[PDB]
Write an enzyme that holds these catalytic residues in place. Structure first.
Site, mmCIF file in Angstrom:
data_model
loop_
_atom_site.group_PDB
_atom_site.id
_atom_site.type_symbol
_atom_site.label_atom_id
_atom_site.label_comp_id
_atom_site.label_asym_id
_atom_site.label_seq_id
_atom_site.Cartn_x
_atom_site.Cartn_y
_atom_site.Cartn_z
ATOM 1 C CG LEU A 227 -2.315 -0.747 1.031
ATOM 2 C CD1 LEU A 227 -3.279 0.106 0.229
ATOM 3 C CD2 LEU A 227 -2.171 -2.121 0.396
ATOM 4 C CG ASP A 228 -0.826 4.876 -0.616
ATOM 5 O OD1 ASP A 228 -1.371 5.620 0.224
ATOM 6 O OD2 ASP A 228 -1.460 4.282 -1.514
#
Ligand SMILES: CCCCCCCCCCCCCCCCCC(=O)OC[C@H](COP(=O)([O-])OCC[N+](C)(C)C)OC(=O)CCCCCCCCCCCCCCCCC
Ligand SMILES: CCCCCCCCCCCCCCCCCC(=O)OC[C@H](COP(=O)([O-])OCC[N+](C)(C)C)OC(=O)CCCCCCCCCCCCCCCCC
Ligand SMILES: CCCCCCCCCCCCCCCCCC(=O)OC[C@H](COP(=O)(O)OCCN)OC(=O)CCCCCCCCCCCCCCCCC
Ligand SMILES: CCCCCCCCCCC[C@H](O)CC(=O)SCCNC(=O)CCNC(=O)[C@H](O)C(C)(C)COP(=O)(O)O
Lengths: 75, 57, 173, 459, 172, 86, 32, 606, 64, 99, 26
Positions: F40-41
């Site tokens: 993810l970020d």
């Protein structure tokens, strides 16, 4: 499940509050029966007129017997 | 209880009680001189009852 | 009663006759009856018990009557003895006077609540009774200071006659 | 009075000759016994004061104040056997010697039948006090405090002495009775004005006075706890008691030459109360609080109104009992935290429940909520001031504002809030502390039933 | 200390959604505008000019302050919430138990015995943990307030007593 | 308010991470590192906490938010703040 | 405990005493 | 002399018994709350009897018990006034307090100091009946601060919370400003009217009480939280919900208003002051309601609705309608207190969350509370043939049918519409919406303590006004000849207040761009009032104490004028005298001069 | 301790008589005192000016 | 070593030695009696017994006597018709005015 | 413990005069 609760010591305050309340009735009640009984043993005086010739005593000019006794002795 | 030791630390409990006795006694001793006017104030100028010797002692 | 009915005047008590128009029973009569035989009767019985116990030995008491004193105005100047006797005479006159206005003031309050909202017209005599007393109090004891003395009271009274008679004689012309 | 004066002296030989550890116990019990004897003076006739002899006489003003002194002596003695038990017996015995002597002068002063006789011992209370602050004090600035206290009251006492002897040389004896009955209206001449200042400044410098209140923060905060009660509970009333006693030969000069003093006291109490709202020391906040109440007393006397005196006596004794109790409150923390900064020991209700309660009704009593005689004291003065001038209430009531904010602010900052994390010395309150404090507030509440005794000579 | 640029963006984004939640109230609209709010975030991510980023942060939070809810939503148990330390009244420090009367102490025998074990263990491990602290101080004084973990075996993490023995958040 | 063990914790935690459609609904290891594993970020990593914050109803300090990087650390932190011990 | 050398004093006139005054309040010269 | 004397006074002394027993500390320290409630329940049943006694005939009585003081001509004595105002308010005050006591057993059933809490409630309860039943102004003072101080501890129940102390301190300050007028009123009546009993004050005609009534108005404003001093009531939400439910709902905050009802026979004569209460009443209705609609806390919104209500009766006080105002207290007491523990029911069940953003769907999930909330909301709007109708519509009908200020009428009409407006907001956000609470749902009301407590106030609110209005004797003149278009406006104005408020509230369903309106930015932040009052004067006075006062005046100037200057003068002169040279030549030269001045210049020779 | 010392004791030894302190002491000092003197005297003179010829109503005022 | 002094003595806990310590005296038995004797000679003998003493003194300030004395004066004064209270306390007849 | 005078307090009294002055400074 129930667990320990941390509270400040109360027994020292419990002792103190017990000591006042118990001891404050050491003469607390005995006068309390005292004041009520004199009110239900001989009562209070009545506003009568002074007798001819009789100059009343200094403690006589009062209604409450404990007040009269305080005026009798003491003052 | 070794009454000698008891009175050693409890004879000190009597000076104040006898101080009041001394102080109370000095009250009537002092006001004896200050009598002067007796049965003279007109609110209390009263006929002396037969064996009554003094109005206010 | 324990008080004279003249110095505590009481208008005659006028109470309505209970007139039940609704056939359903009203409660207010029943709970009074319930209270009567549950609370009032034991209280009266206890009151009777110590009333006859009081009458076992009833000692008397009176009030110390104080002989009249030559007041300040006839007291000799710088005569501390006559002034002390007279100062107490005026001092006692203050306290009985304070109770004079206390009776009138309290009688004033009794009329107001007794007459309900009709108090304005019913307590008209009571109002002027207070007016005749309160006004005199201002020209008898008011503005005498914390350390009031009959000399200051006498001084103020002498100021009153001097002030009013001066205006009266000048106005008379 | 001999029934009180002689017994009060008699403790001194007894305490000096009692056993090693029986000093506090023996002294306290007879000290309580003497206060019981002093209860006899509460009776006052509807007329002239009880004149026992030419040497001593008591009125309806002295007797309520006298009993406060006699009831007080157990309270310092019971408040001091914790911060002095680590000292030698002789110094501890000497501490009782000062306290007993301090009482004896107060008893004789309040009962003096002669004005000049009043002056000697009323001034002579300095010597026993000055020893207390300077010897057993617990800070460096106590020495400058002692000089501040001693010189500040002596600067006014001497002009009173010259004034009193001058009245002797012009009017004969200064017996309180003959002075009252032989009264001469004071003229508005310049000399009489200066005589007025001399007969007044000595007493007015003594309560606080705005401008002359600088000694209270020095003295009360730095004084030992047993002393610290006295500099605020009773000796402030000596400056009070003088006022109603002396303001009978100054009428009507007090009618006019009172605006500067009335103006200083009315605005001053708002200032010094505002000091309490922004103070840092617990004791200083209490002492400055005593300034505002005492300044209210100063205002009360200077109108010469039956209602004013009537609430004046009640305010003094009500304030004196409270200020002592609050000074007990400062002591309780002072033993544990060993510092007087307020924010150092916040959060005491969680740790000490009952001591928080003792701090509670003490604060309300200082709050002067009804029916506590603090309220009956202030409220009576408000009406007397209001009759004197309607604008007074704006200044009068504004004091009730500040006295409300700082009183709870002292409560809220100390008791409520999170407990201090780094402290671990606070132990359970000693039964001595709690019992002492109950003996403060309980008679104060018990007096509320019949404040007819405390009302004063005007009633 | 040093709050890096990407950190402040994360904080601003977190506060933006909280404020946007307060404005939107309803869940479907909350998810609607947050996705739009997200959509207007990820496209300004590949900028090589840091001056653009800090300039972007300038009017972005200036927008945040203008658009902030005057009555934002906070959970009760957080700064400003309706239950912020409302249970702090009941909590009591553990050392206050040392003042308990022996009758009270004997009325909790086993727990107080376990308290003795904690006290003795802390007393023994205090010397070891303080020795570790002084043995690995950064030169020129402690650089950061972060505590070092217990290195060796059979020891306890230095400066552990208050955090481990802190009163519970539900004291009663 | 019935109490809560750590068993109910990761049942509620792993539920919410399963809620993320970007997260594979069957690759939820208890130490699934959000960056290395889920990919993810950090902005999406930030998106996790307010999802957790509403789940358990309490604030997670932002300074501790980025310090949490695995489901276990989230489980550990929620257990500590609510003083969860069984 | 606390000594007289660290305590509030006079206004910082010279920069050298300003640095000492900064340390007196356990703070740095540049921000003090 | 029927039992009317004993029965009323027994209610007061019976209330003291739980306090007296608590002082023993050997008391029922396990089931204290149940012991307290059943005591109030007994007194409630007993206190009914004096009501029907007055109801049957109208026997209003004065009980001048033990004589306390004999201040010169002033006799201060404990005296209870069994007026119609006191005789019926006591059952109502006992009814709500009984209702919440059962709720208090439910809400704070886990507080370790719950016994101490119940002791405080009786202490507050005792101080209130002293306030209601008080002949002399001193007794009115006794109950005034006694209620006031008891609010401080109860608000600061969670003393660990910093903000609770601020609100508790804030409540004392705003109430203290009220006592300035109270003290001023007491002083004037003791000086001019020369008494404090209501009997003399009314009899001794003071029909020009300009300053005394201004003091009375200020006393009411601070205690009843009008405009000028509102914001303490909204901040009083920080205490426990029961404290909010009883004291600040309809028992403590009413005290300011209740004083005006007592002093109505003297209040009516002065035209200027009764226009001032129209001034204060009108603004209080708007601003509190205006800030009400834009709030989010359930307790805040409900409280603002109260402060809007306390704006109402004083509007009626001004135009010769005291009894309707006092009747308005009765009806407002029922539903307004009710709205609190119903919100308290939601709050505790849904994990003590007060933000309206976190409920929804509780209609079918919380049936009884939803019914109770909407019943209170309808009653609060004066909707016909209910508790609100028998008071509010008669008030709105009467206020227009009189010679009043025009600007007051527009405000009362708008306030009533706004009064319904936030009521829709509560039902819309809290109940009629999709659920928004945390996932694990624990909502439940099946506890009998919760059900019975709310139910008692429910069945009370449905009838209440119907029984009371039909039963109390006619005491005013209900105007009859009056056109239709302001007859219906009592209900017309709230129909729109329901209508467009619903339209604007449901607009949040539509996905729309968010924009903070400036008027909303004003209203939502409590009309900016705390941010100026609670920051600007507070900073100045505190700063004046530090810069001036303590530092500049006390220990800088006052300490340097008298003390330090004299010390410096003595120090300099002491230097001069002591600093000599020890030289005989100089000493003897001084002797020669002194000899010369004495023999020549001092003029002693002549 | 430094805060308490600076706020309480270490202030006067650092006080220097300068214009702004001089006028501030005079303003916040004798200022309100003399200002209160004027209004209160104004109230007093107007009040006793009323009663000396009978321009006040206190027919029921007796407990002054 | 600066000067020859001792370090600050550590404050001792009275409870530490005897848990029954009342905070009055260090030595137990006298401390126990100190509570027993400042209480006994405290509340009961002064606060309690003094209260009933100060509650039931003879008539203070002649209050009751004045009221009953006043009441009879009213009864006489109403019967005549003259005002209930003379505005001139001292009799103007035996008063001299300096012209 | 109760604070007691120290040498710096003592040396203040220890000068040739209580109040220093350049004339008496030597
Ligand atoms: C059933 C309950 C009954 C309750 C009764 C009421 C409470 C009684 C409380 C008693 C203690 C409190 C009063 C202490 C009195 C102290 C003495 C006093 O006031 O004057 C000295 C008094 C009066 O002064 P005197 O002695 O100069 O009086 C001389 C004149 N005759 C003798 C007529 C009284 O001294 C005496 O009466 C001497 C005898 C010893 C008195 C001892 C008093 C303390 C112990 C009781
Ligand atoms: C009949 C009698 C029945 C019993 C009465 C018992 C007492 C009572 O309640 O009286 C009510 C009476 C009420 O008077 P009343 O006019 O109602 O009449 C009472 C009789 N009945 C009820 C039948 C009408 O009031 C008093 O007696 C006043 C009591 C005041 C008590 C004050 C105690 C103070 C203690 C101080 C201790 C410390 C001293 C040192 C410090 C001093 C300050 C510096
Ligand atoms: C003659 C009869 C006149 C009758 C008028 C009746 C008006 C009734 C009120 C309507 C407008 C207020 C309203 O609808 O308030 C409810 C609502 C709340 O909106 P908000 O607080 O922003 O919450 C949004 C959450 N997502 O929606 C809102 O838009 C809130 C608006 C807040 C500001 C309202 C200002 C009203 C001013 C009225 C006049 C005042 C005196 C001039
Ligand atoms: C509702 C309230 C009112 C309404 C207003 C609500 C708030 C509006 C905020 C608007 C923000 C604005 O568009 C941009 C700005 O401020 S600054 C530039 C951002 N871009 C960079 O700085 C490039 C470098 N990139 C990184 O730092 C990382 O990539 C990042 C942390 C972004 C993601 O990391 P990834 O998740 O690992």
């Amino acid at each position: 499940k129930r667990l320990f609760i941390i509270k400040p010591s109360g027994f020292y305050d419990r002792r103190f509050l017990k000591l006042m309340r118990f001891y404050i009735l050491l003469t607390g009640i005995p006068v309390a029966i005292g004041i009520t009984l004199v009110n239900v043993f001989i009562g209070e005086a009545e506003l009568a007129d002074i007798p001819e010739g009789y100059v009343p005593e200094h403690w006589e000019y009062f209604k409450h017997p404990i007040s009269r006794w305080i005026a009798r002795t003491f003052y | 209880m070794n009454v000698l030791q008891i009175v050693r630390d409890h004879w000190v409990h009597i000076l104040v009680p006898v101080g009041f006795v001394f102080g109370c006694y000095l009250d009537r001793r002092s006001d004896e001189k200050l009598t002067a006017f007796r049965n003279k104030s007109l609110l209390f100028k009263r006929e002396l009852r037969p064996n009554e010797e003094v109005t206010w002692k | 009663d324990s008080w004279d009915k003249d110095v505590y005047p009481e208008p005659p008590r006028r109470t309505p006759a209970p007139a039940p128009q609704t056939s359903l029973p009203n409660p207010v009569t029943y709970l009074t009856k319930i209270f009567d035989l549950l609370v009032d009767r034991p209280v009266t019985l206890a009151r009777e018990f110590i009333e006859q116990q009081h009458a076992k030995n009833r000692y008397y008491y009176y009030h110390r009557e104080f002989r009249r004193v030559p007041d300040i105005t006839e007291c000799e100047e710088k005569d501390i003895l006559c002034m002390f006797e007279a100062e107490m005479q005026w001092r006692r006159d203050y306290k009985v006077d304070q109770e004079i206005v206390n009776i009138i003031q309290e009688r004033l309050k009794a009329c107001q609540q007794r007459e309900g909202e009709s108090y304005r017209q019913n307590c008209a005599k009571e109002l002027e009774q207070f007016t005749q007393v309160s006004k005199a109090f201002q020209d008898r004891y008011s503005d005498l200071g914390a350390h009031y003395s009959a000399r200051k009271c006498l001084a103020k009274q002498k100021q009153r006659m001097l002030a009013e008679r001066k205006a009266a004689k000048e106005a008379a012309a | 009075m001999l029934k009180i004066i002689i017994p009060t002296t008699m403790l001194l030989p007894m305490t000096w000759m009692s056993k090693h550890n029986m000093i506090w116990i023996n002294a306290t019990v007879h000290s309580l016994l003497i206060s019981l004897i002093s209860l006899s003076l509460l009776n006052q006739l509807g007329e002239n004061s009880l004149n026992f002899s030419l040497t001593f006489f008591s009125d309806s003003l002295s007797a309520p104040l006298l009993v406060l002194t006699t009831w007080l002596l157990p309270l310092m003695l019971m408040a001091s056997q914790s911060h002095l038990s680590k000292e030698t017996t002789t110094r501890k015995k000497l501490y009782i010697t000062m306290l007993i002597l301090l009482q004896l002068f107060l008893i004789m002063t309040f009962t003096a039948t002669e004005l000049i006789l009043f002056y000697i011992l009323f001034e002579a209370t300095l010597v026993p006090t000055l020893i207390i602050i300077t010897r057993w004090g617990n800070q460096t600035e106590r020495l400058n405090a002692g000089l501040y206290f001693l010189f500040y009251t002596l600067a006014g006492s001497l002009p009173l002495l010259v004034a009193l002897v001058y009245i002797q040389n012009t009017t004969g004896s200064l017996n309180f009775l003959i002075i009252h009955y032989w009264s001469h209206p004071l003229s508005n001449s310049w000399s009489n004005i200066f005589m007025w200042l001399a007969c007044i400044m000595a007493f007015m410098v003594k309560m606080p006075l705005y401008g002359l209140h600088l000694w209270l923060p020095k003295a009360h905060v730095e004084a030992p706890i047993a002393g610290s009660m006295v500099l605020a509970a009773v000796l402030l009333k000596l400056g009070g008691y003088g006022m109603m006693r002396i303001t009978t030969i100054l009428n009507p000069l007090t009618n006019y030459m009172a605006y500067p003093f009335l103006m200083l006291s009315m605005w001053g109490m708002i200032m010094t109360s505002s000091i309490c709202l922004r103070q840092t020391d617990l004791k200083s906040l209490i002492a400055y609080s005593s300034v505002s109440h005492m300044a209210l007393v100063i205002v009360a006397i200077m109108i010469q109104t039956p209602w004013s005196f009537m609430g004046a006596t009640a305010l003094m004794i009500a304030h004196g009992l409270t200020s002592s109790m609050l000074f007990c409150l400062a002591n309780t923390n002072y033993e544990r935290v060993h510092s007087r900064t307020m924010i150092l020991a916040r959060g005491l209700q969680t740790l000490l429940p009952l001591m928080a309660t003792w701090w509670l009704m003490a604060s309300l009593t200082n709050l002067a909520l009804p029916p506590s005689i603090n309220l009956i004291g202030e409220l009576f003065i408000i009406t007397a001031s209001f009759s004197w001038s309607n604008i007074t209430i704006i200044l009068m009531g504004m004091n009730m504002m500040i006295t409300a904010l700082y009183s709870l602010y002292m409560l809220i900052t100390t008791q409520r809030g999170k407990y201090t994390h780094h402290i671990n010395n606070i132990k359970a309150s000693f039964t001595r502390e709690n019992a002492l404090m109950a003996l403060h507030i309980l008679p104060l509440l018990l007096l509320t039933l019949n404040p007819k005794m405390i009302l004063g000579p005007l009633y | 200390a040093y709050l890096t640029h990407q950190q402040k963006v994360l904080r601003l984004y977190k506060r933006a959604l909280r404020h946007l939640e307060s404005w939107c109230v309803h869940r479907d609209k909350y998810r609607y505008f947050a996705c739009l709010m997200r959509a207007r975030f990820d496209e300004h991510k590949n900028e090589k000019d840091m001056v653009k980023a800090t300039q972007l942060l300038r009017q972005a939070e200036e927008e945040f302050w203008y658009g902030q809810h005057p009555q934002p939503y906070i959970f009760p148990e957080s700064p400003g919430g309706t239950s912020y330390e409302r249970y702090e009244c009941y909590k009591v420090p553990e050392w206050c138990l040392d003042d308990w009367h022996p009758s009270e102490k004997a009325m909790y025998p086993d727990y107080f015995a376990k308290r003795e074990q904690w006290k003795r263990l802390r007393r023994e491990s205090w010397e070891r943990e303080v020795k570790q602290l002084q043995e690995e101080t950064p030169p020129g004084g402690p650089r950061t307030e972060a505590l070092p973990p217990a290195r060796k075996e059979g020891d306890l993490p230095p400066l552990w007593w208050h955090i481990v023995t802190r009163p519970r958040e539900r004291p009663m | 308010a019935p109490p809560l063990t750590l068993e109910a914790i990761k049942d509620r935690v792993l539920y919410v991470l399963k809620l993320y459609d970007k997260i594979d609904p069957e690759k939820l290891s208890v130490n699934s590192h959000f960056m290395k594993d889920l990919g993810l970020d950090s902005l999406d990593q930030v998106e996790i906490i307010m999802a957790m914050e509403d789940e358990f109803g309490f604030e997670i300090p932002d300074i501790d938010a980025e310090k949490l990087m695995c489901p276990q650390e989230i489980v550990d932190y929620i257990a500590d703040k609510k003083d969860v011990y069984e | 405990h606390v000594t007289k050398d660290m305590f509030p004093g006079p206004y910082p006139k010279t920069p050298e005493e300003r640095a000492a005054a900064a340390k007196k309040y356990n703070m740095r010269v540049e921000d003090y | 002399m029927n039992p009317f004397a004993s029965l009323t006074l027994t209610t007061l002394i019976i209330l003291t018994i739980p306090i007296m027993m608590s002082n023993s500390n050997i008391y029922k320290t396990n089931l204290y709350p149940n012991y307290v409630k059943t005591t109030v329940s007994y007194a409630f049943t007993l206190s009914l009897v004096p009501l029907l006694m007055f109801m049957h005939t109208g026997q209003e009585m004065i009980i001048s018990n033990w004589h306390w003081m004999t201040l010169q001509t002033v006799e201060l004595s404990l005296s209870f006034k069994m007026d119609y105002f006191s005789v019926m308010f006591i059952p109502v005050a006992l009814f709500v307090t009984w209702s919440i006591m059962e709720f208090s057993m439910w809400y704070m059933h886990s507080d370790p100091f719950i016994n101490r809490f119940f002791k405080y409630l009786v202490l507050f309860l005792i101080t209130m009946m002293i306030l209601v039943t008080a002949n002399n102004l001193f007794q009115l003072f006794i109950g005034w601060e006694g209620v006031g101080i008891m609010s401080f501890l109860l608000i600061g129940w969670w003393h660990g919370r910093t903000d609770a102390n601020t609100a508790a301190l804030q409540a004392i300050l705003y109430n203290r400003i009220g006592d300035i007028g109270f003290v001023l009123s007491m002083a004037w009546f003791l000086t001019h009217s020369n008494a404090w009993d209501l009997q003399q004050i009314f009899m001794l005609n003071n029909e020009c009480p300009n300053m005394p009534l201004i003091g009375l108005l200020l006393a009411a404003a601070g205690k009843s939280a009008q405009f000028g001093l509102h914001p303490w009531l909204p901040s009083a939400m920080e205490g426990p919900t029961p404290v909010s439910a009883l004291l600040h709902s309809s028992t403590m905050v009413v005290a300011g208003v209740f004083l005006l009802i007592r002093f109505y026979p003297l209040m009516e004569t002065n035209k200027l002051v009764q226009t001032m209460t129209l001034c204060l009443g009108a603004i209080t209705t708007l601003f509190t309601a205006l800030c009400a609609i834009t709030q989010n806390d359930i307790k805040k919104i409900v409280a603002f609705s109260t402060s809007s209500q306390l704006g109402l009766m004083m509007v009626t006080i001004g135009i010769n309608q005291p009894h309707l105002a006092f009747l308005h207290i009765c009806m407002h007491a029922f539903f307004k207190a009710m709205l609190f523990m119903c919100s308290g029911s939601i709050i505790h069940s849904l994990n003590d969350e007060q933000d309206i953003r976190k409920m929804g769907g509780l209609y079918k999930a919380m049936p009884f509370t939803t019914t109770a909330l909407i019943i209170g909301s309808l009653a609060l709007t004066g909707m016909p043939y209910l508790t609100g109708f028998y008071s509010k519509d008669l008030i709105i009908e009467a206020v227009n049918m009189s010679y009043t200020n025009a600007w007051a009428l527009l405000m009362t009409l708008i306030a009533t519409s706004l009064t319904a407006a936030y009521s829709t907001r509560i039902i819309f956000f809290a109940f009629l919406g999709k659920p928004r609470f945390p996932p694990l749902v624990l909502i439940n009301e099946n506890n009998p303590l919760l059900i019975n407590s709310i139910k008692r106030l429910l069945i009370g609110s449905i009838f209440a006004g119907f029984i009371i209005s039909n039963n109390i004797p006619p005491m005013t003149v209900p105007n009859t000849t009056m056109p239709l278009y302001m007859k219906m406006t009592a209900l017309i104005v709230t129909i729109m207040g329901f209508m467009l408020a619903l339209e604007l509230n449901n607009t949040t369903y539509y996905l729309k761009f968010k924009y903070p309106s400036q008027t909303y930015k004003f209203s939502n932040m409590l009309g900016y009032y705390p941010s100026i009052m609670h920051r600007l004067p507070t900073y100045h006075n505190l700063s004046m104490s530090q810069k001036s006062a303590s530092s500049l005046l006390d220990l800088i100037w006052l300490e340097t004028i008298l003390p330090k200057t004299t010390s410096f003068i003595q120090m300099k002169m002491s230097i001069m005298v002591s600093n000599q040279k020890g030289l005989i030549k100089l000493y003897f030269l001084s002797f020669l001069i002194t000899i010369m001045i004495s023999m020549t210049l001092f003029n002693y020779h002549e | 301790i430094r805060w308490t010392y600076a706020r309480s004791a270490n202030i006067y030894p650092n006080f220097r008589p300068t214009p702004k302190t001089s006028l501030l002491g005079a303003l916040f000092g004798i200022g309100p005192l003399f200002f209160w003197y004027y209004v209160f005297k104004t109230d007093r003179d107007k009040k006793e000016k009323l009663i000396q010829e009978g321009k006040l109503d206190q027919t029921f005022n007796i407990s002054y | 070593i600066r000067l020859q002094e001792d370090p600050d003595p550590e404050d001792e806990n009275l409870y530490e030695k005897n848990p029954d310590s009342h905070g009055y005296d260090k030595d137990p038995i006298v401390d126990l009696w100190n509570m027993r004797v400042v209480f006994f000679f405290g509340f009961s003998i002064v606060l309690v017994l003094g209260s009933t003493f100060v509650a039931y003194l003879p008539d203070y300030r002649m209050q009751e006597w004045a009221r009953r004395e006043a009441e009879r004066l009213v009864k006489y004064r109403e019967a005549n018709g003259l005002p209930l209270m003379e505005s001139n306390c001292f009799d103007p007849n035996k008063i001299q005015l300096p012209e | 413990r109760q604070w007691q005078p120290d040498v710096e307090w003592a040396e203040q009294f220890g000068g040739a005069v209580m109040y220093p002055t350049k004339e008496t400074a030597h």
